[PDB]
Every structure is written in C-alpha cells, then in structure tokens.
Amino acid sequence: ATKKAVAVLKGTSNVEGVVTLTQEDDGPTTVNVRISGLAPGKHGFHLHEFGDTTNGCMSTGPHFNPDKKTHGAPEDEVRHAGDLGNIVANTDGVAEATIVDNQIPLTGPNSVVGRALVVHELEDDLGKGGHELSPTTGNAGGRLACGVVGLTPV
Amino acid sequence: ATKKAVAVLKGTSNVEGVVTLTQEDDGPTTVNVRISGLAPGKHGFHLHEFGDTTNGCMSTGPHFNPDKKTHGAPEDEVRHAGDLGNIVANTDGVAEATIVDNQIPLTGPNSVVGRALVVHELEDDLGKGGHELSPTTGNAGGRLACGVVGLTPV
Amino acid sequence: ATKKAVAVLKGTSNVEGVVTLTQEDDGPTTVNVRISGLAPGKHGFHLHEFGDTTNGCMSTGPHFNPDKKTHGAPEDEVRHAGDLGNIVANTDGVAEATIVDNQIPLTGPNSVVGRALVVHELEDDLGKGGHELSPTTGNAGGRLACGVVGLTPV
Amino acid sequence: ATKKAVAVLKGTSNVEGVVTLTQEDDGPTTVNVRISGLAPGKHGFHLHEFGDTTNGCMSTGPHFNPDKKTHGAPEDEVRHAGDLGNIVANTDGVAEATIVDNQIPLTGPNSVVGRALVVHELEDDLGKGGHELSPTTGNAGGRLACGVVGLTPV
Ligand SMILES: [Cu+2]
Ligand SMILES: [Cu+2]
Ligand SMILES: [Cu+2]
Ligand SMILES: [Cu+2]
Ligand SMILES: [Zn+2]
Ligand SMILES: [Zn+2]
Ligand SMILES: [Zn+2]
Ligand SMILES: [Zn+2]
C-alpha cells in the first residue's frame, strides 16, 4: 500500500501553489512543494490543525499538535507536529522544496487528510527567538496561502 | 463525540457555495448547503472520490462509491454513496438544502474527509433515465464548483 | 556524511527480525524495523545499554540512559534514551515501522554503535502504569529477540 | 578509562564461541578467545570491516583495513589491521587464545566497536603463500562463525 494527497495553496495574495504528499506502507511521507508569488527569502510552512477555509486561512487554526509540545524545527524533539521549517523563495518568487517528515501521516489517527498546509509571510524562528509567539508560531506570522489536504489517485 | 467538517465551493464560474457536515456518535450525517450563482432549477450534488482540485474540478474523479454500485438517489438502495440527489435554485440563484444521509461518514473506512463535493450544471437523473451516463453521473454533467472537505473545530 | 547500521535480531524463540538505522550529518535517526514471529498487538522496542549477548538476551542491561531519566515514551521529555515506544504486530505476526528519534546517534558520545535493540513480549506502559517496573521497563518484561548494533556500508 | 567488549561467535554451523576484548587508556587491547566444535588444527581469526550479519558472515566484508595495506601476520609490517592470525583448536576442538594487539582500538578512529570477528575454516597463509587471495584473505576463506563486537559492562 501507498498513499498520496495534494494541496492547492490559494490566498487573496498573488501567492499560488501546489504540494503533493506521498506515503509508503506507514513509514514517512515525502512533501514536494512549489509555490510562486512570495518575496525571495525564508518563509514558514506548517500543517495547521483544521481544514476550514471559510475565514480565509485564519480558520485553519493552530499548528497540528497531537503530541502537545512547543514549536520547533522539523529536526527537533520539542516541535509541534506540523512544523516543516522554512522553504526558501528564489529571486523570482518561486519556491521548490522537498521535506520527508515522519509526523505527518496519511493514515490512522493523526492522519493529515482534510487538514491544511500554510505558507507564512516572515521566516519561522524554529522556536529559537524569545518572542512570545516564538514558542507557538515561530513568529512566521502572516498566512499567505493554505489549502486542504485531499485524496488524489496514485 | 461530535465531528464537524466544511467545504467551501468555488469553481471557475461565478458559482460560490459553502457546506458544513456534522456527525454525532458514529451515526447519520447532516449536510447544510448554501450555494449562490446557479441557474434556477435542479442541479446535481454529489460526493466525488478525490480531493484532487489541481486540474480544476475535473480531478475530483468519479462519485464516491465504496460499496461499488450504480448511480441513484439517496432514497434508492442501488445508489453510489456520494449521491446526494438534487438541490434546487431559487429565482435569485440560491439553493439552501439540508441533507441527512447515512452513507457519508466522517470517521472510519468510508470517511468523506479529504474528498470533494461538486455542484453539477444540469439535473440529476437519479439513474431513472436510460442515457448511458445515467448509471454513472445522472447525466447531470459539467462541474460548476467543488470543495475539499476539511475538518472544522467542534 | 551519511552513516548506516543494522541489527539482525534473533532469540531463543521464533522471533527473527532486522532493523537498520541511518543518520546524516549530525541530526536525527531513522530506524526501519521489520520483525516476524511475534504475536498480534503491541510489544516494547528499546535500545538496551550493552550489546553483550553472552547470557542470551538478559545480558543487554537496562535501557540506554545517558541523560539519566525515568522510563517514558519517545514523545516524552522525562524519557530514558533507549525508549522507542511500541511496534505493532499484524495478524500474521509481522511488525514494520519507521521511527525518527533524535536520542540514538551513530556518532560521537551517546553513539549507539555496539549496543542492542530489543523487542519485548508484553506491551510497554509508557511509564503510565504504577507497577514498580513502570518507571524502569514499562512492564514490557520478556526479551524475545535482540541484536547488537553493527556498522554497514551506505 | 578502561573498556570491555565481547562478541559471541555463531555461524550456520556447529561452531560456537565468545571473544572479549579489553583496552585501557588508549593503548593495546587483549583478546581472550574460546570457540568449540571447530576441527583440530589452524583456522584464520580476523576482524572484518562491517558488523552486518544479515547475509550470514559473507556480508561482514573484507578484513578491517584502515591503513590500507596487504595481508599479513599480526607480527608483520605489511599487515591489514583485522589480521589476528590463526588460533589453534585442540583434538576435542576447543581453541583458547590471548592475542594482544595494538591495531584494534575500542576508542576513537579505527575503533572496532560495531565490527565483526570471524573464525575461518582454513589456516590463514599469513600472506606467505602465493595462491592469488594470499595478499587479501591469506587463503583461509570459509566463514564458520562470527559476531558483532558489542559493549559489555567495563
Ligand atoms: Cu503555521
Ligand atoms: Cu457528480
Ligand atoms: Cu527494554
Ligand atoms: Cu577473515
Ligand atoms: Zn508549530
Ligand atoms: Zn453517482
Ligand atoms: Zn526505558
Ligand atoms: Zn587480512
């Protein structure tokens, strides 16, 4: 068995995007990301709790956090669950990244089907800042685009 | 143990729409539907298989059919599973429908999370015709708008 | 700079197994586990201090615990070091998983090269129960097969 | 700053064994060997590069050779590093040796933690022979038994 899902990032900004999530057996997931319309630099890219979209991206809620932890980097132990770091945006405003994460499954409890991915305006602190929002958001603050993770064929 | 979901409809037309689904215990589900920008009359309201959305609405696939059957009406035993009948537009181009189905859960195998709801341009046959697409689409055809069923707080 | 290891588990039982551990630079470690001969359900999976093996599986000492902690779950601050939670066995007695831990390096101090990986008979408590051995073992007690962590190519 | 390691030899044959290795400060290391049910006479006794063991002893690879040299006897300049020479089994087929070498450390680079000790079925040439594999395996080929060098309570 192998699973796949897609997420078409759209906002009220000139930010577009599409991200494909792949998963084998019930091991890790591969996420391929291509987003355009962003300022060159480091962003913030998380798997936000809910799939809403009714109130733009401001209803996809907080970070997906079944383990009840603090905010971190993908390579940390205290991290949310939805932390996926920063994606770098090229000089033309396109961002292409590949992250393989073992906390965003496509099956069972904790599955990330019908949740949302959000690309953030400002670079995420990885929880390293001492901001107030650091321990919760990475101060990546400003949701440019999201979309719900849905099922895609195979 | 109540579970709620949402689906914000938007196609490449001026057909908008927003749907909420609710489920208690592990029972029947209630769909509340409100869609605007539709030609007066009956249309098609189905639960299509995939959340795709990447080549518009034509990526959602066929209707959701776990039981593998023919197309029909909710009140029909032969029915697909994703088949939610027809919704009728007022003279202002609005359809406000309240559907209560037992074939579109939010939990377990057959869960409609991460999938899509599409509003068809023409009326649903219910399989009652003998068109050829009757057994498959209700000859309702032409996806005017769709949405990825995402999780919403409870 | 990337590094791999493998643990070919064998017991005085019918539990066979093989596990690999990969680590790049000086980040986290991916552990791909596959066992057979086990009984449907949850076990215990820990990195025991010694590789020993002379007096079967009982010479592996307790769980690797350099940071001196109590027993817990992988997603626990208070946790041991060698705690790797529970692996699930299917209906044919076969377990496969993919653990991404950050407490079992393959480099420098705390390196787990030459140490043992054990699969236990009972399920681990997560140190949630209040047995006596809850804070020490997770009352998983019963060493079904173990292997010493050995170097393998790349 | 003392250390100890053990390795418990077992092959797909009636050849058993346990070796311990001991190092103090960052000097020499004493190896105590005992193996049973080997055929009377000389064997080969080497430290092989990898600890593998998934395709029996044949995946342990070549002899541990960091200084990149040819094959030889413990007392030889031209020596591999893994080359521990031959051990002699008695008429009841037991073999007990105490090899003291300066080339299989247990700390730092060249460390043989996570490597394998392999007893060959034929007598090792010491590189004197002119076979063709003499400068490689010392023409002792036949991996009767082996094991991963693992840590043991100091
Ligand atoms: Cu975020
Ligand atoms: Cu349809
Ligand atoms: Cu244990
Ligand atoms: Cu050899
Ligand atoms: Zn977070
Ligand atoms: Zn249908
Ligand atoms: Zn423990
Ligand atoms: Zn050699």
Side-chain angles (χ1 to χ4, degrees), chain D residues 51-85:
Chain D
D52 263 308
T53 268
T54 78
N55 168 220
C57 290
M58 250 82 166
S59 82
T60 71
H63 295 157
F64 177 49
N65 186 8
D67 292 0
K68 296 156 149 252
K69 284 186 155 53
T70 18
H71 182 89
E75 12 50 42
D76 264 298
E77 201 326 68
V78 162
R79 224 206 104 150
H80 280 131
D83 308 355
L84 257 31

mmCIF file of all heavy atoms in Angstrom, chain D residues 51-85:
data_model
loop_
_atom_site.group_PDB
_atom_site.id
_atom_site.type_symbol
_atom_site.label_atom_id
_atom_site.label_comp_id
_atom_site.label_asym_id
_atom_site.label_seq_id
_atom_site.Cartn_x
_atom_site.Cartn_y
_atom_site.Cartn_z
ATOM 1 N N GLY D 51 29.889 -4.951 10.691
ATOM 2 C CA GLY D 51 29.194 -5.827 11.626
ATOM 3 C C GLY D 51 28.078 -6.501 10.915
ATOM 4 O O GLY D 51 27.461 -7.311 11.662
ATOM 5 N N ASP D 52 27.657 -6.216 9.728
ATOM 6 C CA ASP D 52 26.460 -6.722 9.029
ATOM 7 C C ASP D 52 25.761 -7.915 9.681
ATOM 8 O O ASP D 52 24.954 -7.699 10.630
ATOM 9 C CB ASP D 52 26.651 -6.885 7.534
ATOM 10 C CG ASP D 52 26.243 -5.898 6.540
ATOM 11 O OD1 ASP D 52 25.114 -5.398 6.453
ATOM 12 O OD2 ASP D 52 27.114 -5.540 5.634
ATOM 13 N N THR D 53 25.832 -9.080 9.198
ATOM 14 C CA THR D 53 25.290 -10.372 9.666
ATOM 15 C C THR D 53 23.953 -10.715 9.046
ATOM 16 O O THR D 53 23.389 -11.795 9.293
ATOM 17 C CB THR D 53 25.456 -10.411 11.242
ATOM 18 O OG1 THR D 53 26.730 -11.042 11.529
ATOM 19 C CG2 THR D 53 24.304 -10.932 12.075
ATOM 20 N N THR D 54 23.381 -9.833 8.174
ATOM 21 C CA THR D 54 22.095 -10.186 7.519
ATOM 22 C C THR D 54 22.209 -11.283 6.459
ATOM 23 O O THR D 54 21.237 -12.061 6.241
ATOM 24 C CB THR D 54 21.277 -8.973 6.982
ATOM 25 O OG1 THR D 54 21.933 -8.639 5.774
ATOM 26 C CG2 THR D 54 21.080 -7.714 7.859
ATOM 27 N N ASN D 55 23.306 -11.370 5.685
ATOM 28 C CA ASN D 55 23.562 -12.471 4.730
ATOM 29 C C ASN D 55 24.760 -13.266 5.374
ATOM 30 O O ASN D 55 25.898 -13.246 4.970
ATOM 31 C CB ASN D 55 23.834 -12.070 3.306
ATOM 32 C CG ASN D 55 24.391 -13.191 2.390
ATOM 33 O OD1 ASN D 55 25.283 -12.921 1.569
ATOM 34 N ND2 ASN D 55 23.937 -14.404 2.607
ATOM 35 N N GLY D 56 24.420 -13.791 6.558
ATOM 36 C CA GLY D 56 25.412 -14.553 7.358
ATOM 37 C C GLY D 56 26.692 -13.751 7.471
ATOM 38 O O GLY D 56 26.663 -12.491 7.628
ATOM 39 N N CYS D 57 27.780 -14.416 7.414
ATOM 40 C CA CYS D 57 29.130 -13.857 7.642
ATOM 41 C C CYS D 57 29.771 -13.211 6.459
ATOM 42 O O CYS D 57 30.836 -12.593 6.500
ATOM 43 C CB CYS D 57 29.965 -15.066 8.166
ATOM 44 S SG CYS D 57 29.396 -15.510 9.863
ATOM 45 N N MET D 58 29.143 -13.470 5.321
ATOM 46 C CA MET D 58 29.651 -13.064 3.990
ATOM 47 C C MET D 58 29.339 -11.647 3.716
ATOM 48 O O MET D 58 29.752 -11.157 2.625
ATOM 49 C CB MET D 58 29.329 -14.090 2.913
ATOM 50 C CG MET D 58 30.671 -14.772 2.485
ATOM 51 S SD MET D 58 30.954 -16.050 3.763
ATOM 52 C CE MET D 58 32.261 -17.033 2.962
ATOM 53 N N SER D 59 28.658 -10.978 4.639
ATOM 54 C CA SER D 59 28.331 -9.551 4.412
ATOM 55 C C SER D 59 29.082 -8.694 5.425
ATOM 56 O O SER D 59 28.937 -7.473 5.483
ATOM 57 C CB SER D 59 26.827 -9.371 4.233
ATOM 58 O OG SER D 59 26.053 -9.311 5.367
ATOM 59 N N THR D 60 29.970 -9.338 6.166
ATOM 60 C CA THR D 60 30.848 -8.728 7.161
ATOM 61 C C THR D 60 31.943 -7.975 6.440
ATOM 62 O O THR D 60 32.708 -7.198 6.999
ATOM 63 C CB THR D 60 31.493 -9.749 8.164
ATOM 64 O OG1 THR D 60 32.485 -10.526 7.388
ATOM 65 C CG2 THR D 60 30.600 -10.746 8.880
ATOM 66 N N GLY D 61 32.067 -8.315 5.127
ATOM 67 C CA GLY D 61 33.016 -7.737 4.208
ATOM 68 C C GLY D 61 34.432 -8.220 4.416
ATOM 69 O O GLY D 61 34.637 -9.259 5.053
ATOM 70 N N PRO D 62 35.350 -7.460 3.833
ATOM 71 C CA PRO D 62 36.780 -7.742 3.896
ATOM 72 C C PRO D 62 37.292 -7.562 5.312
ATOM 73 O O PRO D 62 36.522 -7.144 6.217
ATOM 74 C CB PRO D 62 37.420 -6.699 2.981
ATOM 75 C CG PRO D 62 36.434 -5.560 2.943
ATOM 76 C CD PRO D 62 35.087 -6.196 3.075
ATOM 77 N N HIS D 63 38.561 -7.742 5.477
ATOM 78 C CA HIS D 63 39.228 -7.528 6.783
ATOM 79 C C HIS D 63 39.343 -6.043 7.035
ATOM 80 O O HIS D 63 39.720 -5.220 6.147
ATOM 81 C CB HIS D 63 40.620 -8.178 6.782
ATOM 82 C CG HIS D 63 40.645 -9.667 6.658
ATOM 83 N ND1 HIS D 63 41.803 -10.342 6.172
ATOM 84 C CD2 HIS D 63 39.748 -10.600 6.834
ATOM 85 C CE1 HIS D 63 41.423 -11.655 6.131
ATOM 86 N NE2 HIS D 63 40.225 -11.833 6.584
ATOM 87 N N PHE D 64 39.092 -5.665 8.269
ATOM 88 C CA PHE D 64 39.259 -4.268 8.736
ATOM 89 C C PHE D 64 40.662 -3.811 8.305
ATOM 90 O O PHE D 64 41.724 -4.323 8.754
ATOM 91 C CB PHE D 64 39.035 -4.185 10.247
ATOM 92 C CG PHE D 64 39.259 -2.817 10.846
ATOM 93 C CD1 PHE D 64 38.677 -1.684 10.281
ATOM 94 C CD2 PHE D 64 40.028 -2.658 12.004
ATOM 95 C CE1 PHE D 64 38.917 -0.429 10.755
ATOM 96 C CE2 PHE D 64 40.284 -1.412 12.506
ATOM 97 C CZ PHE D 64 39.696 -0.275 11.905
ATOM 98 N N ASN D 65 40.676 -2.786 7.479
ATOM 99 C CA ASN D 65 41.939 -2.280 6.891
ATOM 100 C C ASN D 65 41.931 -0.774 6.719
ATOM 101 O O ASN D 65 41.733 -0.274 5.561
ATOM 102 C CB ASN D 65 42.067 -3.071 5.527
ATOM 103 C CG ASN D 65 43.389 -2.805 4.842
ATOM 104 O OD1 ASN D 65 44.267 -2.134 5.475
ATOM 105 N ND2 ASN D 65 43.506 -3.115 3.577
ATOM 106 N N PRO D 66 42.232 -0.049 7.755
ATOM 107 C CA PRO D 66 42.207 1.416 7.694
ATOM 108 C C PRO D 66 43.434 2.016 7.070
ATOM 109 O O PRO D 66 43.412 2.993 6.268
ATOM 110 C CB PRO D 66 41.927 1.802 9.128
ATOM 111 C CG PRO D 66 42.558 0.731 9.961
ATOM 112 C CD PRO D 66 42.527 -0.543 9.126
ATOM 113 N N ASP D 67 44.583 1.454 7.433
ATOM 114 C CA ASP D 67 45.902 1.921 6.999
ATOM 115 C C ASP D 67 46.142 1.463 5.575
ATOM 116 O O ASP D 67 47.250 1.779 5.031
ATOM 117 C CB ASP D 67 46.978 1.549 8.004
ATOM 118 C CG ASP D 67 46.951 2.219 9.341
ATOM 119 O OD1 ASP D 67 46.013 3.084 9.586
ATOM 120 O OD2 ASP D 67 47.716 1.934 10.265
ATOM 121 N N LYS D 68 45.206 0.798 4.970
ATOM 122 C CA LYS D 68 45.246 0.290 3.630
ATOM 123 C C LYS D 68 46.604 -0.399 3.354
ATOM 124 O O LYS D 68 47.552 0.237 2.814
ATOM 125 C CB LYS D 68 45.077 1.364 2.592
ATOM 126 C CG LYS D 68 43.736 2.109 2.564
ATOM 127 C CD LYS D 68 44.060 3.480 1.892
ATOM 128 C CE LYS D 68 42.915 4.010 1.121
ATOM 129 N NZ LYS D 68 43.077 3.952 -0.360
ATOM 130 N N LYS D 69 46.665 -1.667 3.659
ATOM 131 C CA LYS D 69 47.893 -2.444 3.399
ATOM 132 C C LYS D 69 47.531 -3.769 2.800
ATOM 133 O O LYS D 69 46.299 -3.954 2.444
ATOM 134 C CB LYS D 69 48.575 -2.644 4.775
ATOM 135 C CG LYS D 69 49.244 -1.328 5.187
ATOM 136 C CD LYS D 69 50.061 -1.515 6.490
ATOM 137 C CE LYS D 69 51.165 -0.426 6.503
ATOM 138 N NZ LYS D 69 50.485 0.943 6.288
ATOM 139 N N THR D 70 48.511 -4.637 2.668
ATOM 140 C CA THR D 70 48.257 -6.008 2.223
ATOM 141 C C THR D 70 48.093 -6.905 3.444
ATOM 142 O O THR D 70 48.192 -6.437 4.601
ATOM 143 C CB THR D 70 49.342 -6.592 1.235
ATOM 144 O OG1 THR D 70 50.495 -5.748 1.400
ATOM 145 C CG2 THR D 70 48.840 -6.686 -0.202
ATOM 146 N N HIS D 71 47.828 -8.179 3.173
ATOM 147 C CA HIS D 71 47.580 -9.147 4.238
ATOM 148 C C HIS D 71 48.856 -9.684 4.846
ATOM 149 O O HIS D 71 49.899 -9.883 4.128
ATOM 150 C CB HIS D 71 46.619 -10.260 3.849
ATOM 151 C CG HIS D 71 46.228 -11.288 4.845
ATOM 152 N ND1 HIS D 71 45.147 -11.232 5.736
ATOM 153 C CD2 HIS D 71 46.836 -12.464 5.040
ATOM 154 C CE1 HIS D 71 45.135 -12.392 6.396
ATOM 155 N NE2 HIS D 71 46.106 -13.135 5.997
ATOM 156 N N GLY D 72 48.782 -9.958 6.134
ATOM 157 C CA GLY D 72 49.945 -10.471 6.856
ATOM 158 C C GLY D 72 49.610 -11.009 8.216
ATOM 159 O O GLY D 72 48.446 -11.226 8.533
ATOM 160 N N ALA D 73 50.684 -11.320 8.933
ATOM 161 C CA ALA D 73 50.568 -11.920 10.300
ATOM 162 C C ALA D 73 50.553 -10.758 11.270
ATOM 163 O O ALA D 73 51.038 -9.651 10.943
ATOM 164 C CB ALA D 73 51.804 -12.815 10.520
ATOM 165 N N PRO D 74 50.023 -11.022 12.477
ATOM 166 C CA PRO D 74 49.943 -9.992 13.497
ATOM 167 C C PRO D 74 51.295 -9.288 13.553
ATOM 168 O O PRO D 74 51.378 -8.063 13.414
ATOM 169 C CB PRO D 74 49.570 -10.731 14.755
ATOM 170 C CG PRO D 74 48.886 -12.008 14.306
ATOM 171 C CD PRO D 74 49.382 -12.246 12.896
ATOM 172 N N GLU D 75 52.339 -10.088 13.657
ATOM 173 C CA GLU D 75 53.726 -9.578 13.704
ATOM 174 C C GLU D 75 54.210 -9.464 12.273
ATOM 175 O O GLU D 75 54.752 -10.451 11.714
ATOM 176 C CB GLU D 75 54.669 -10.453 14.492
ATOM 177 C CG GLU D 75 54.341 -11.826 14.957
ATOM 178 C CD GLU D 75 53.785 -12.800 13.998
ATOM 179 O OE1 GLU D 75 54.213 -12.921 12.813
ATOM 180 O OE2 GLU D 75 52.829 -13.408 14.480
ATOM 181 N N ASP D 76 53.944 -8.368 11.639
ATOM 182 C CA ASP D 76 54.310 -8.028 10.278
ATOM 183 C C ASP D 76 53.944 -6.512 10.141
ATOM 184 O O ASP D 76 52.996 -6.059 10.800
ATOM 185 C CB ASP D 76 53.803 -8.836 9.147
ATOM 186 C CG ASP D 76 54.695 -9.902 8.622
ATOM 187 O OD1 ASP D 76 55.842 -9.539 8.113
ATOM 188 O OD2 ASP D 76 54.402 -11.103 8.610
ATOM 189 N N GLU D 77 54.751 -5.890 9.336
ATOM 190 C CA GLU D 77 54.647 -4.501 8.998
ATOM 191 C C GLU D 77 53.548 -4.291 7.933
ATOM 192 O O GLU D 77 52.717 -3.373 7.964
ATOM 193 C CB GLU D 77 55.988 -4.091 8.312
ATOM 194 C CG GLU D 77 56.404 -2.637 8.272
ATOM 195 C CD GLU D 77 55.370 -1.592 8.155
ATOM 196 O OE1 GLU D 77 54.559 -1.333 9.023
ATOM 197 O OE2 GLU D 77 55.386 -1.009 7.028
ATOM 198 N N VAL D 78 53.652 -5.107 6.928
ATOM 199 C CA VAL D 78 52.810 -5.121 5.713
ATOM 200 C C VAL D 78 51.370 -5.417 6.000
ATOM 201 O O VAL D 78 50.529 -5.153 5.097
ATOM 202 C CB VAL D 78 53.587 -5.943 4.692
ATOM 203 C CG1 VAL D 78 52.818 -6.478 3.514
ATOM 204 C CG2 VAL D 78 54.759 -5.079 4.210
ATOM 205 N N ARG D 79 51.008 -5.836 7.139
ATOM 206 C CA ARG D 79 49.725 -6.149 7.725
ATOM 207 C C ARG D 79 48.449 -5.387 7.503
ATOM 208 O O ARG D 79 48.426 -4.145 7.461
ATOM 209 C CB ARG D 79 50.153 -5.953 9.235
ATOM 210 C CG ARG D 79 49.628 -7.023 10.101
ATOM 211 C CD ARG D 79 49.486 -6.557 11.498
ATOM 212 N NE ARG D 79 48.143 -6.258 11.954
ATOM 213 C CZ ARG D 79 47.780 -6.401 13.245
ATOM 214 N NH1 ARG D 79 48.677 -6.832 14.151
ATOM 215 N NH2 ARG D 79 46.578 -6.015 13.661
ATOM 216 N N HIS D 80 47.232 -6.054 7.473
ATOM 217 C CA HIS D 80 45.960 -5.438 7.260
ATOM 218 C C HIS D 80 45.511 -4.503 8.408
ATOM 219 O O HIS D 80 45.337 -3.231 8.109
ATOM 220 C CB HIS D 80 44.636 -6.199 6.871
ATOM 221 C CG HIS D 80 44.496 -6.550 5.421
ATOM 222 N ND1 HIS D 80 44.134 -7.843 4.989
ATOM 223 C CD2 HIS D 80 44.823 -5.879 4.331
ATOM 224 C CE1 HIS D 80 44.181 -7.787 3.601
ATOM 225 N NE2 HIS D 80 44.621 -6.653 3.243
ATOM 226 N N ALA D 81 45.130 -4.988 9.525
ATOM 227 C CA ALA D 81 44.716 -4.466 10.767
ATOM 228 C C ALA D 81 43.745 -5.442 11.515
ATOM 229 O O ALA D 81 43.794 -5.486 12.764
ATOM 230 C CB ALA D 81 44.098 -3.142 10.887
ATOM 231 N N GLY D 82 42.967 -6.066 10.729
ATOM 232 C CA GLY D 82 41.972 -7.081 11.110
ATOM 233 C C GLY D 82 42.672 -8.428 11.342
ATOM 234 O O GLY D 82 42.179 -9.226 12.161
ATOM 235 N N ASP D 83 43.785 -8.608 10.667
ATOM 236 C CA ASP D 83 44.619 -9.802 10.711
ATOM 237 C C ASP D 83 45.065 -10.194 12.117
ATOM 238 O O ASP D 83 46.037 -9.588 12.620
ATOM 239 C CB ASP D 83 45.890 -9.711 9.881
ATOM 240 C CG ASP D 83 45.811 -9.322 8.471
ATOM 241 O OD1 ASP D 83 44.703 -9.146 7.882
ATOM 242 O OD2 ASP D 83 46.826 -9.247 7.756
ATOM 243 N N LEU D 84 44.376 -11.157 12.698
ATOM 244 C CA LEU D 84 44.796 -11.591 14.094
ATOM 245 C C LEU D 84 45.522 -12.922 13.999
ATOM 246 O O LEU D 84 45.954 -13.510 15.017
ATOM 247 C CB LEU D 84 43.610 -11.395 14.964
ATOM 248 C CG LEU D 84 43.419 -10.246 15.946
ATOM 249 C CD1 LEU D 84 44.090 -8.927 15.552
ATOM 250 C CD2 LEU D 84 41.927 -9.986 16.120
ATOM 251 N N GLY D 85 45.757 -13.398 12.765
ATOM 252 C CA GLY D 85 46.475 -14.667 12.555
ATOM 253 C C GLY D 85 45.572 -15.828 12.682
ATOM 254 O O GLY D 85 44.345 -15.715 12.421
#
